[PDB]
């Protein structure tokens, strides 16, 4: 649900769309994440590992 569950009822949203929201939140246009979705997911996965 992203951050919505903290403010009220949890509203579901696809995770990549939530990541696009958050990329907007730091001043990067969402097309950047949609174009680097796989690279970003791999970077996150390796960071967790």
């Amino acid at each position: 649900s992203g951050w919505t569950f903290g403010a009220g009822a949890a509203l579901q949203i696809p995770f990549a769309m939530q990541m696009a929201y958050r990329f907007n939140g730091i001043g990067v246009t969402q097309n950047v994440l949609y174009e680097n979705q796989k690279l970003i997911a791999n970077q996150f996965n390796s960071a967790i590992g």
Binding site: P14, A16, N31, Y34, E35, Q37
Partner: peptide
């Protein structure tokens, strides 16, 4: 983009500039 969908994106200018 993964998840992109085929649809029309309307243009306000096109019908107008024809006039």
């Amino acid at each position: 983009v993964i998840g992109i969908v085929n649809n029309t994106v309307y243009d306000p200018l096109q019908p107008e500039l024809d006039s």
